[PDB]
Design a protein around this ligand. Structure first.
Ligand SMILES: COc1ccc(C(F)(F)F)cc1CC(=O)N1CCC[C@H](C(N)=O)C1
Ligand SMILES: [Zn+2]
Length: 139
């Protein structure tokens, strides 16, 4: 679990979104595994606006933060689940690192701020859904 709170927005994994998130929907994209809902309180997370390929993520299954190198956002296959069919997920970045299903929502950050959130994992790999292109999160 986990979310990004920026301004009057809450960014979560779409597959983990709640009834309130769907009832206060701003935007969602199944192909990115993202959902943004509105909030009644101001968020202060800084979204990074950069092309960094190094950063630190929070890994709930280890109660620890890990430094990682990660790929540029791209399309990558993801197998079925209670949430999605086998398909390509866009705006996804991979890194070598530990992750388990409940790790989705963990923040990845670089020196510029929030980069994205854990969305996939498996094989000693960790996938992050990028949020740096969502310029409207600030305005
Ligand atoms: C961080 O997640 C994982 C990490 C590890 C594993 C391992 F296979 F090893 F058991 C599995 C996962 C879970 C996973 O990748 N997905 C299930 C939920 C929806 C995700 C999506 N964005 O389509 C895909
Ligand atoms: Zn950066």
């Amino acid at each position: 679990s986990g979310a990004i709170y920026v301004g009057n927005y809450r960014v979560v994994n779409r597959h983990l979104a709640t009834h309130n998130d769907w009832a206060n929907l701003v935007w969602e994209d199944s192909s990115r595994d993202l959902l943004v809902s509105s909030t009644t309180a101001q968020g202060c997370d800084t979204i990074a606006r950069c092309d960094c390929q190094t950063g630190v993520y929070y890994c709930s299954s280890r109660r620890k933060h890990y430094p990682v190198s990660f790929s540029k956002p791209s399309l990558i296959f993801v197998e079925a689940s209670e949430y999605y069919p086998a398909r390509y997920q866009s705006h996804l970045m991979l890194a070598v690192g530990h992750s388990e299903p409940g790790d989705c929502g963990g923040i990845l950050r670089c020196q510029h701020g929030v980069v994205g959130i854990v969305s996939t994992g498996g094989n000693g790999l960790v996938g992050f859904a990028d949020v740096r292109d969502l310029l409207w999160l600030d305005e």
